[PDB]
Structure formats: C-alpha cells, structure tokens
Write an enzyme that holds these catalytic residues in place. Sequence first.
Site, PDB file in Angstrom:
ATOM      1  N   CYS A  68      -9.217  24.598 -16.034  1.00 24.62           N
ATOM      2  CA  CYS A  68      -8.448  24.666 -17.266  1.00 24.62           C
ATOM      3  C   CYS A  68      -9.333  25.042 -18.451  1.00 24.62           C
ATOM      4  CB  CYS A  68      -7.753  23.333 -17.541  1.00 24.62           C
ATOM      5  SG  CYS A  68      -6.920  22.579 -16.129  1.00 24.62           S
ATOM      6  N   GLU A  88      -4.266   1.230  -2.969  1.00 20.73           N
ATOM      7  CA  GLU A  88      -5.022   1.190  -1.722  1.00 20.73           C
ATOM      8  C   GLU A  88      -5.764  -0.136  -1.656  1.00 20.73           C
ATOM      9  OE1 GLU A  88      -7.710   4.468  -1.091  1.00 20.73           O
ATOM     10  OE2 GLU A  88      -8.693   3.420   0.569  1.00 20.73           O
ATOM     11  N   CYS A 114      -7.778  19.068 -12.488  1.00 24.31           N
ATOM     12  CA  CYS A 114      -8.254  20.071 -11.542  1.00 24.31           C
ATOM     13  C   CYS A 114      -8.593  19.369 -10.234  1.00 24.31           C
ATOM     14  CB  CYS A 114      -9.401  20.873 -12.131  1.00 24.31           C
ATOM     15  SG  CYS A 114      -8.924  22.025 -13.428  1.00 24.31           S
ATOM     16  N   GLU A 122       0.832  -1.198   0.000  1.00 27.94           N
ATOM     17  CA  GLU A 122       0.000   0.000   0.000  1.00 27.94           C
ATOM     18  C   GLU A 122       0.869   1.250   0.000  1.00 27.94           C
ATOM     19  OE1 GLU A 122      -3.030  -0.232   3.169  1.00 27.94           O
ATOM     20  OE2 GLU A 122      -4.434   0.521   1.658  1.00 27.94           O
ATOM     21  N   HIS A 180     -13.622  22.406 -12.599  1.00 23.74           N
ATOM     22  CA  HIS A 180     -12.508  22.614 -13.511  1.00 23.74           C
ATOM     23  C   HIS A 180     -11.991  24.044 -13.435  1.00 23.74           C
ATOM     24  CE1 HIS A 180     -11.956  18.924 -15.830  1.00 23.74           C
ATOM     25  NE2 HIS A 180     -13.264  18.748 -15.782  1.00 23.74           N
TER      26      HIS A 180
HETATM   27 ZN   LIG Z   1      -9.713  20.896 -15.722  1.00 23.02          ZN
END
Ligand SMILES: [Zn+2]
Lengths: 295, 295, 291, 296, 295, 292
Positions: free
Chosen positions: F227, F155, F262, F150, F225
């Site tokens: 971008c 995970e 993001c 891990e 977001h």
């Molecule tokens: Zn983005």
Amino acid sequence: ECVVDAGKVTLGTQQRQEMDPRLREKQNEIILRAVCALLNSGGGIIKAEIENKGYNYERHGVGLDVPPIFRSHLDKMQKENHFLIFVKSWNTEAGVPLATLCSNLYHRERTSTDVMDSQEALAFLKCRTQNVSAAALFDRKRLQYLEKLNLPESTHVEFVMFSTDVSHCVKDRLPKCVSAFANTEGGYVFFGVHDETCQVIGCEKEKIDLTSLRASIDGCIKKLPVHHFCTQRPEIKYVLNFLEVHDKGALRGYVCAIKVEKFCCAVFAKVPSSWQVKDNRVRQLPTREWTAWMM
Amino acid sequence: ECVVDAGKVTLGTQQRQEMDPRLREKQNEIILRAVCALLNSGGGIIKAEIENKGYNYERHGVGLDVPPIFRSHLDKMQKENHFLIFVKSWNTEAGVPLATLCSNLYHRERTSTDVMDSQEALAFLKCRTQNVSAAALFDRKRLQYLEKLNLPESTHVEFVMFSTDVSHCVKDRLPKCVSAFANTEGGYVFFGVHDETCQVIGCEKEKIDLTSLRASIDGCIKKLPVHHFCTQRPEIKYVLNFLEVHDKGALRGYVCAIKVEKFCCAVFAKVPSSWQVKDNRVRQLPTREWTAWMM
Amino acid sequence: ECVVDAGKVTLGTQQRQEMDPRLREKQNEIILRAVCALLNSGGGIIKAEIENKGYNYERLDVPPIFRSHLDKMQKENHFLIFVKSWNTEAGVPLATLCSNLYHRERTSTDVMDSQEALAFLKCRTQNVSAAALFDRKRLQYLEKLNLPESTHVEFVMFSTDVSHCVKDRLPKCVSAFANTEGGYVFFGVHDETCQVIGCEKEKIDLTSLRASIDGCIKKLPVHHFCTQRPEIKYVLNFLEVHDKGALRGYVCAIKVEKFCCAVFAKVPSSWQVKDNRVRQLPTREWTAWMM
Amino acid sequence: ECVVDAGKVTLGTQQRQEMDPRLREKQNEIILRAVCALLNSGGGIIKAEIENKGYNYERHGVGLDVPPIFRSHLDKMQKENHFLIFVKSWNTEAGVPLATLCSNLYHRERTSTDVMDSQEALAFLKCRTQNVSAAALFDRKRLQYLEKLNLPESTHVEFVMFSTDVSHCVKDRLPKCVSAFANTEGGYVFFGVHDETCQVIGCEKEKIDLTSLRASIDGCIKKLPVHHFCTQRPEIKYVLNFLEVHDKGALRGYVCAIKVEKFCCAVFAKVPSSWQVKDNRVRQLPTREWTAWMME
Amino acid sequence: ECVVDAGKVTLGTQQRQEMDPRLREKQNEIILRAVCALLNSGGGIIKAEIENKGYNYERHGVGLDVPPIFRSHLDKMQKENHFLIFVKSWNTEAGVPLATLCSNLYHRERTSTDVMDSQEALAFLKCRTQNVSAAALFDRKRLQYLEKLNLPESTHVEFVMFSTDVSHCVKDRLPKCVSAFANTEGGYVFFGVHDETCQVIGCEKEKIDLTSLRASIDGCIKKLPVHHFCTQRPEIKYVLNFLEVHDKGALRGYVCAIKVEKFCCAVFAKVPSSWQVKDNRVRQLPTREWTAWMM
Amino acid sequence: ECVVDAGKVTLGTQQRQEMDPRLREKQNEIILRAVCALLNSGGGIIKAEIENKGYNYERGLDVPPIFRSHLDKMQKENHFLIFVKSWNTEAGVPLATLCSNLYHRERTSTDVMDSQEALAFLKCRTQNVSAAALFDRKRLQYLEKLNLPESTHVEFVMFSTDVSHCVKDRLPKCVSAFANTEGGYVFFGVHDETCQVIGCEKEKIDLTSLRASIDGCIKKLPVHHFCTQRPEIKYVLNFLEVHDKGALRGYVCAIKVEKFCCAVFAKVPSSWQVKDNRVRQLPTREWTAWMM
Ligand SMILES: [Zn+2]
Ligand SMILES: [Zn+2]
Ligand SMILES: [Zn+2]
Ligand SMILES: [Zn+2]
Ligand SMILES: [Zn+2]
Ligand SMILES: [Zn+2]
C-alpha cells in the site's frame, strides 16, 4: 452336647488360597453355620475329615476367616485324618443374646445402606418397641439419556446401576434397599442411574417387560420378612414408577424407581441368618424365633 | 438535480465523539438516507448548517459513518456556516443497481444469522428466480431449569436469550431470525437458552402471557415483508411451541420456541432501507419497488 | 381456668381437605395459639361454633406433644377442647409452638425444637475458598462455583421479588449462622448446581437494599448471657455478575460471624393467656421462662 | 418397449397412510426399481392391479414417495381395475447419464457422512480418474465408563452408538462409514461413544466375542464393492482396535474402533442401486457396469 | 523457680502489626516455647528487653498469639526497659496433664485432616491402649491430563495439589497425611489432583525423578515418630504408586499416590511440640517422654 | 550449470530409518536447500559421498513431490549425484519455494500457505465480542472453563515447560496467521481441547521482561507492504491474572493482533539461491518480489 459333621473340607491357608473359591466358601459357610448353631444351642463339637490328607497342621494356622466374637468361643483340635472344633456356649455377657451370623436388617446412613450387626440390630429393635427434589424426580415422566441429575445420593435416594439381567438385578438388590429405607426414614431407589456420576443410563427397552417386572417387584417386596411390635400391624408401603428414558428421536429405555415409605416396626431382606441345632441337624431358626429371642 | 437539507448538524471527529451519541446517530442517519436517495436518482446536493460553528474544514470524519462505496461518490464542501455534499449518481457499473443502505434480507450460515449485502442479496434473488435432535427438542414438553441441551447451535437452530422485557425482546429479535431461516434451509429458534453454554433458563412465568404472546408472534410474523417469484405464492410456514421449564418442585418459566420452514422465495425483516427522492423529498421506496429495481 | 373462643371453624378431615387452604390454616393456627396459651398457664377450655353444621365429629394439624394434653368435646353446634396444664415432666418447660431459633448442620439450616433449643441455651450460658468467593468482585453469568454448600456457606436463589426474597429468607440464615460457627449466605446461586444466576440489575437498588438488610438484621431478636452484650456482626457484599462483557446483575452475599449467645429470626412463637386474650410472650419472657 | 408388472399394489394417499408400512414400502420399492430399470434401458410401461378397488383415482394421490427427477419422466394412467405408468427414456441432458436410485458411494464432509447423489458421484469419479488426538485415542488401551472424550466429531472421527445387537449394528453401520472415509481423507470410527455428548459407553462384555467380531469386520470390509482407476489396484487399508471400558472395580465393555486410510479410487457400501431390464425382468446392474456406464 | 530470657522482642499490638512478620513470629514462638516449658516444669518468670523502648506502656494489648488455656496461667509485668511474664505451674485440673503446644498427631474426619488438640489426643491414646473406587484409582496406571475423577474426597482419599517445588511439597505435606490416615481408618492421598474440582494435573515430567523421590518418600515415612502400646511393634505399611498423566500425544507428568494402611497404635508427623526446661535451658521433650507423660 | 556438495550423507530407506533422526533431518534439509537453490537459479548437479558405503542403490526419501518431478538420481562409486532441472514456470507458481512462512487461520487451525495459496494471497493483497470480553477480564480463576470457543479469531495454546521459549517460538506463527486473515486473539495458558484456564506458575515468569521479549519478537517479524502508507502491525498484550482459592497462582498471556493491510511472515521465507559460493537463501524482499 452335640456332634456336627461338616464332611470333606480342605484345611490350610495356602491350600485354601489355591482351591476353587466356590467350594472354599461353601465349606466355610458350612463351618460358620455349624459354629452359629452350636453357639446358640449349647456346647458342641464339629468334625470334618481333611481332604488334602498330605497337608498336615502347622501349615494352616489361623485361616478360613473366623469372626472375632466367634473365635473367642471355639478351640482347634487335630486328630489323625479328622479335624474337630470345640464350640463353647454363646456368651450372654456381651449384652447381646444368641450368636447371629447376619442380622439381614439393613439401614441407610448418609450415602451407604448397611446391614446392622448384632449390637446395632439389638438397639434398633429396642428403639422400635417404644427430598423435595427427590419427590420431583419420582413424579417425573420422561428422562433424557445421559441426563445428569442434580439430586445427590443421600439418606433418602440411592442411585444403583442395572446389571446385564434386569430381573435378576432388581430381584437381588431390591430387598436390601427397601429394608434399609423402611428401617430408616424411608426414601427412593433409582435403577439405571450411575451413582458416581448421577447420570441416567436407562436399561434397554428391548430387555425389560414392565407389567411382568412390576408383578415381580410386588412379589419380592411382599415376600420380605417383617416383624411387628405395634397393634395395627400394617404392610410395607411402596410405589413403583417406570421413568421413560429417551435419546434423540424416541424412547430408548427405562429407569426403574421404587419409593419406600418409612416403616413402623422392622423389615428384613431375607430370613435372618441365625442357626440352631435341632434334634439331629443344624436348622436356621425362623424370623419369629429370631426376633423374639433377641427381644 | 435536487437540494436536500439535513438541518442542524454537528461536524468534526472530536466534536461528534464528544456529542450526545443519540443525536449524533440521528443526524448521521439523516445524512445517510439523503445520500442514498440522491444516489439512486439523479445526482444531488445536501446542505446543513453546522451547529458547532467553531468548526474548521478538513477536521471532519473522512467516513463519519458512510459505507466506502458511498464515500467514493460524494464530495465535501464547506461554505461559511453551511456544509454541502456533492452526490454523484449511483454507478451502475458495480453490478449492483439501486445502491441500498441495508437489504434487511437475512440468511444464516453455520452459527450466524447475517444480513445480506447488496451483492449477496442480488445473487440470492437471482437464485430464487430460478436436525432430528432439533425436532426432538421442539417436540419436547418439559424442560428442566439450567438443563444443558446437547443440541448445538447450527444452521438450523439458534439459541437466543430473553431480555428484561419478553414481548419487546421477541418482537425485536424474531424478524431477523425468521427471515434468515426462511431464506436458508429454515430451522428453529429457541428463546430462553444461553448460546455460549446451551443451558435452559427461560423467562419467569410471572412475566409472560402465553396466549397474548402467541397472538403477538402471529401478528409480528404475518407483518414480515415478503416478495414472491413463484406461481401460487404461499405464506411463511411457522410453528410456535411454549416449552415448560421447571426447577425442583414445579414450573418456573417458559422457553419460547419457533420453527420456521424453508421459504419458496425471499422474506425480509423490515421494509428494505433504500431511499428515493420523488416529490423533491426523501422517501424510502417500498418493498415491491425495491425488489423489482434490484431485478 | 380460662375461656377462649376460636369462633367460626370447620371441623372434619374430609371437610377441611375440601376447604380453602388459606382459611383452613388461619383457623388451625388460631387453635394452635389458643392451645399453646392455655397449655403454658394453667388449664383451660376452648370453644368454637362449627361452620359446616351438618358435619359432626367422626363423620387436624395438631402437634403430637399437644395431642397428649387436649381432649375433644362435641356439644350441639359448638366444639370444645379440654387443655391440661403443660406437663413439665418432659424435661422442657412451657409449651412453645416454634422456637424461631435456627442452626445450620451440614447442608441444612433448621429451626431447633424445644429440646434442642433448651440444650442450646444451656450450652450458651457456659472456608478459605468461601472467604475468597466473598472477597471477589466480578462473577460471570452461569459460572459454576467450586465452593460447595456446607456448614459455612448457603446457596439460595432469588425469588421473583428481590426485596421480599431477601427480607423473608435472610433472618433464618443469619440466625442459623450466628448460632453455629457462622458462615456465608449467597443470594443468586442455584444450590443444586452451584451456578451463578444473578438477579437482573434493573430489578435492584444497591444502597436502598443495603439499608433494608441492615434494618432487617438489626431488628432481629437477640438474647444475651455474657457481660458485654454486643450486636451481630455481619458484612454485606454485592458481587457483580457479567455476561458477554456486559454487567447483567448482582449476587447478594452476606457474611455472618459466629455469635456469643443466641439470635432469633422472629419473636418466638409461644403464647400466654392474659386477662384479655391469647398474647404471645415477648423474647425476654420466653428466654427467661425456658430457664 | 417393455412390460413390467408390479402386481397387487394399494393406491391412494389416505389409503397408503392407513396401510401396513412394511407392505407400503415393499410396493413402493417395486415401483421405484421398475421405473429405474425402464428409465435406464429405454421406454416402458408399468402395470399393477389396484388392491383397494373401491378407492379409485383422484384419491390415488400424487404422493407415492418417488424421486422428483423420476416424476418428470413418468405419466400416470388409470384403467378399470389396473394402473399403468408411462416411463420415458432417462434424459441424458441433465449432465448425468443413467437414472440411479442410490449411488451407495458415501463421503464424510465436516460432521456428516452422506451418500453422494448422481451429480456428486459423477464429479467424484471424475476427480478420482485424475487428528493427532484422534490417533492418540486409537492408540489408547483402556477407557473408563462414561469418560467424556475431548476429541470432537470431525471429518476424521465419527462417534456412533451401539444398537441392542452388536454384530448386526456394526455389520449394518460399518460399510457406510468405511466407504465415507475411504472416499474423503479417511479417518476413525468409534462404536460405543455417544456422539452428542462424546461420552464412552461401549457394549457390555457379555454381549461380544472379540476374535469372532474381528473376523466379521474383516469379512464385511473385504466384501465391500471397490472400483479402481489407478495402475496398482490395491485393497482397503483398515485397522481394528478394541478399547477396554472399565468402571469402578473392573471392565464392563469395549468400544470398537476402526481406522480407515484414505483410498486411491472409490469404495462402495453395497452394490449401487441402479436397475436394468434384462429380456424378461428387472435386474440391477452390477458394480462394474454401473461405474463404467457412469463414464462416457 | 526458673529464669528464661527471650531477649530482644518488640511489644505492642500496633507495633507488632507494623513489624517484619518473620521476626514477629520468631519472637512469638520463643515466648510460646518458654511459657510451655515453665508451665510443664514449675512456676517461672520470663524476661525480655523491649526493642521499641518508647512505644510500650499499656499500648500493648492482650493481642499476641497466646492460647487461652495458657493465658489463664500468665500474668504480665512491665518494669523499666524490660518485660516479664509470671507463669504459673500447669493447672492439671483440666483433666489433661502437661501443657502441650501442638500434639503433631493428625487424624482425618470427613474431608479434613486435622491436628488433635490436647483433649482429642488424650482420648485418642486412651482408645489406642485398648473405597473400592479409591482402590481402583490406586491400581490404575495411566491418567489423562485434566481428567475429572469421580472418586470424591472422603475419610479415605485426600486430593492435594503440588506446589512449585515437587520434592519440598511432598516432603512437607506428606507427614500430616500419613499420620492422619494411620490414626483413622487409613486411606489414600493423591498428589497432583485439584481438590475442589477432582481433576488430574500432576507435576511436569521434567521436574521429577521417580526413583529418587521414591527413596525420598521412603525416608520421610520412616523418619516420622511412632509410638506403640501393643506387643509386636510393626512399622507403618505404605505403598507408593506413580500414575502417568498424558495429554494428547504422550506423557506429560505424574500424579503421586500414597496408600497408607490403618495403624495399630499412634503415628506422629513430627516430634510433639511440648517443652521442658532442663538444667537451665529450654529443651523440647522427645516423643517417648511426651507420650508417656500424657499417661 | 553448478556443482553443490552435500558432503557426508548416510543413504538408504532402511538405513535412514535406523539412523540418528537429528543427523537424518540435518542431511535431508541440506539436500532440500540445495535442490531448492538449484531449481530457482538454473540447472544443477548435487554430489555427496555415501556414508554407509556398503549400502548402495537398490537398498526415495523425504522430498516434496513437485521437486521429485525435477530431480534425477544417479549412483557412481562411493558418490551419489542428483540432476536438478530448472524450476518449471509452466506450473502456476514461479520460483521453487520450500516454505512460504506465511501463515493464515482457516477455521480452528492456523496453517502455513503453500506456493499457490501464497501466490493468490499476495495477488489479492495487491488490490468475537466474547473474545474481546475475555481479553478485558484481567482476572481469571484456575481451571475456569471459558465459553469462548476456538475459532478464526481466538486460538487457545498451552504453555511448555519454558514460558519464554514457548511464547517466543509459537507466537510468530499466530501473529502472522491473524495479521493475514481477519486478525484475532491468541491466549497462552488455556488448554484448547477443554477450554480451561491453566495459568503458568507466577514464580516462572517475569511480566515486564517477557513483555519486552514479545515486543522484540513481534517487531522482528518479516513484513512486506503493497500500500501507500506502510504501517507496523498493531498488537496489544494483556497479562490475565489466574487465581485459585486464596490468592494469585499464575498468568494467562493474551495477545490481540489486528488484521493487517498487506502480508506478514513468521520467519524469512525458506527459498534458496545459488551464489558463486553456495546455497544462499534469498531475503524477504527478493522472495516476495520474485513471486510477482
Ligand atoms: Zn501495507
Ligand atoms: Zn408395626
Ligand atoms: Zn414463493
Ligand atoms: Zn452475649
Ligand atoms: Zn486404485
Ligand atoms: Zn502398634
């Protein structure tokens, strides 16, 4: 043909379950020795005054463990404050001569060393009248603490743990082991390895003296009762190795390994538990007389 | 300020994915060396005739294989059967002066040795201008085959496996390791232990010569590029140990362990990959010029 | 009834302990072949000039049953052995040096002795997880298998040379399985740890080695008692051994069905004296002579 | 401004390597205590007659196992049969006041409990002026011998092994642990588990008294030096649990677990090793004076 | 001496391999029951109309689940659209009386519980007419999830896994186990431990009722057929323990352990599969009649 | 300048320790929502009739400490009031949020970012081989001990009694944490402390249906977001077969989650407004915009 007195003994199943275990087994061994002696010599009678005199018979029943072969020979008797046991002569028709209490002849099958019974010992002396990874582990010089060995317990290797006292542990458990190996294929015993996990648990270095314990191992192995059938009657061939057990940094303890060669004839752990009644008292016959009488 | 010719190169994402990967990476490395060389010196122009002549513009690899900092400086140009790259002068405004392709300066954090980037190497040289169980494993003399070591990979120990060829494997993987240790706390590297399992395998004894390989280790280690800032300017302190690896009976192979002391200044794996245009030709600047230009 | 010459041999316990082991066991095995041959056919005498001529007797690797038949003789620079005819009274006929008949009890494959082979041929005149491991296709490097070595599976390791290892160790295994319940043998698994250590992929050709095992297994000496006399039924599977998502080697598995009659590893080591020399009788003559 | 006599000391790198190590470090610690005291109080001079009087200087060796910060303050001098050390006043410009020999303030980061240095202790006290599986292991009642625990050593759990003597082992090794936990997030320490393997061994039952050792743990933890910055100056919050360790038939020993809560201020293991010169002799300043003097 | 009708059955090796396995084994078991009954009573004939009436005519095979001892008694017959089997009376010269299909008498040697064959059951009943770490595991109280136990599967302990349905799994697999233990040395069976790995898994706590399942095992254990030869005819002595299985936080499931004492006489799993034809109907003889007829 | 009614609440430390935990946390979470909303919008006062009316004051409870500095307790007859100051912008965090629901994986633990960590995270966003091998394996053995440990990229999580509920509940945290930090793999059916494979029983899972379920749960995830190109989160699901002896027993359910440009949430961030009627949790857009 003989009286024999056990003395003060407590009778009764419930009463013996509720009595000091040490004294219980002391009394018991007195009765077993007496029954063995009377069995081996002729007919006899045992006597013992009841201690708990307010507890009477029909509260005892069968109790104070009686070996099944022996049970067929004795007969219970209750008279006033005393208790008697009628011991018939040991039957010779059960192919085995003289009733023996414990052969003290050990042999290792697969993963268990075990004391031979009367029959197994009989056939054993009858027979005597006519691995690589283990060796690698013995030749090893330096074990690591909590190392898991890949050598598995077998007819040739026996992993045993140390007790709190090293000297007492090896002096008590070694005779059984060296007897079992010498009587069956030989092999190695390792002290300080945990059998169920095959990991190395060395005994602490501060709690062992190597030269002194080696002298102790030599004494214990030489003192072992041996009986020979061959011409050139040799000694037991053993070799002792102290394996170092480190952990991190530096030495922590030792694993105490003993290699025991297969033995020509037969070797005991202690003088065989079989009993006579000589003149006036029960007296355990010695090794020569036992193995010769067993013939 | 300079022409530079890559030569016969295949352009196009799909076309280069469908081309011999070796020749693809050959061409690519030529372009990257050229872009670095033009970058550190005055601006320049790269030219290369397209091999796949059925190539149309804007079907290229936006970053065929170019670090993003480089992509912002170049500008692609397509003219008839030739392709040009306009390389602006390397901006000193990023805090990094030379624009290097690969620092070849390694350092080990936690469980990973890693080559420093431009910034990490800068701050590193700036800083240089101003465990017990591991040692136990190194001091050991005899490992068992498939022994699971309890020493875990850390900033000081690195378990690496052998390849099919021992000499090539250690000669290829050692410089990265000794550099990484020399630059950060030092430590041990073990060859023949499997990292994910921490078991001992070791190279077969028949496929290794110890004295010859040790001479090879010494030669390879002396050959490492070193740059000093200090007074006495010492050499790298290494110690080589061949650990024996047995299995059952007797010796099977060896684990090849190298201990590397922490180093005063900085140690490289190979001459740092940074490129100049001197006598109108691409020429990788040597180690001294690189570390001095980095300031 | 026969002369037989061992030739130049070194006599003496200490002197042979101090002699080149290769030549020592060559000489010894020559003596064993000669004593076996004279043993099986009449009485005979062996002679051999002593090499270390300054060492005399009382200044060898001989089976105990044979020891009861021979008698040592020392005369000048030569040494003689008086070989009595093989005592048919030890319920076993004709002295055999090694049966080459293997069988696997519990965890060990073992070559049968004269008596065990006798009773075996007499008897012949009248698991799921293992199959799962064989049916697999992709093992991981240093995977610890939970299938334990038993009468049906045998984990054996590769040597430095794969071809030599399988070509040398396979006959014993397939014989032992064919004679007792059958079972599987896996090459590349370490027996004491039951981990998978495949042989490196660069050091093996699969089709060629498959032809090699096929040849080695078919050429094995077989003797039949039944009406229909079939061949040994084996199946070979190469298990892939990956590590870190990257094929590394193969584990070489052979499944061997239980066999109707008896299967050998090599032609049984038992010897005759023919008008010319000591000559090991072939498989038919051995198996017929045992009866 | 002060004389200080070390007495009979053996000088020389080779000569000290070839000398009884116990007496070696006894002498060494005398020199280190003297240099610390002279550093902290003012200027001073140390004197000591050389024992091996035929082994003189240019053999006496730069090597004497002396902290490097201290070496920058002292200056060695050799005269006839005596040896002197010129100790300058401790330089306060290295942001840390008063030369400390050992802070005895421990803290456990990731996998190691460690004694803070002068700087780390400074920033620590400055900061102080303003898991589930572990709890499960603590709540357990009976572990099996050579059981491999799946709880791994971390900033909250510390596996430590027993020595030959249980009482001495826990009485010596506990203060470091409880200090380290008290100063950083707290956590659990387990005695009788082997750290590298996370297996359960435990001390043999015949070699331990449970109630007596519990009283010993209480005494040792209460005796710990504590300094407070907050209003309600509380005590250390600890809880001791003895886990039974069985094997086959019946119990063999115990694993001795101590849970230590995170502490408001700072907790020491022993009185911090820092030294004064009081009129006539070297005298280690107590905890109060050390922690107060560190702040200025 | 008797007709017996199997009815609609599909004949043919290829055709039965290509037929619904459920109906295939149904038909097969009808044939085996009929042939067993005819064997046990007296020579008889079986009849059955072929289903695939165009597929059978020497395109069947000796194949079909028929015990070889039985096959030596049968004789196949093909007549138009019907198939007949000539069943001779049971041999009795094989030292074993009455053809039995399955003894349902189990015994555990080494690592395997196994149903005795006719001969093994014969010698077993003939014989009946004339560990510490395991106990520690049973006495425990609280197991951890995925704990690897060091007690190994042996003649005294049997690790068995749960199925998807706990009640059905224990109700189906328990009789075999308790029979096998009762007939040979006794021992322990643990439900929820994986045999090949000796780890603790246990059935999820939400998928088990302890009191209800305890009543269920008590019922199943009482319901199994027992036959005695001795004077006092006691019941099988069993004890059930639910071991708790936690993981991290708190209780996850249970491992269901049953200890079974060695039994005086013989214990079955189900009424022994052996068949008679009474009046004019196949009827499996009950337990008493089976064990008495075995003699 | 707003009233808000919590209603029937049972008050008292001893009394709340001795009260039904479910109703306890119901009441508590209502108070926390009210305090968050009043904090974020302006000043306010909370009112609530005490249930255990004989247990009054002189007989503190579950509220974040940053909130405690804003509240002021008042006890009047059978009712209890809370004076909520406007959320101080003087702390490095604007707006008072109860839980960011933005997860990220540091080392071996996935963790929900606090107000500060989320602030610096969104601000920064405005400007391994063995794991991949395990994903490709397709065929695991039961109780196989994996050597992949891990880490920030893998995970190991266990199944519950209900597979669908377990993955539908625990997946959003994981995919958010990976999307926000380097990405990585999550495996369902491997026991983290031991790294052994415990496949979920084959009879207790439908492969296509559960794959549609994870697809739905992953698409429904709140995303914000910064971008130019605003893509979706790139995930890939693989069902690894888990055999034991004989034949297939279960499946280990593996999900690979790519690093995300993001920020990705698990649920709509727990932050609250007061509208003309009651407490109304502001949606994702309003929360992430208000953080700026
Ligand atoms: Zn983005
Ligand atoms: Zn003898
Ligand atoms: Zn330097
Ligand atoms: Zn045949
Ligand atoms: Zn305080
Ligand atoms: Zn009975």
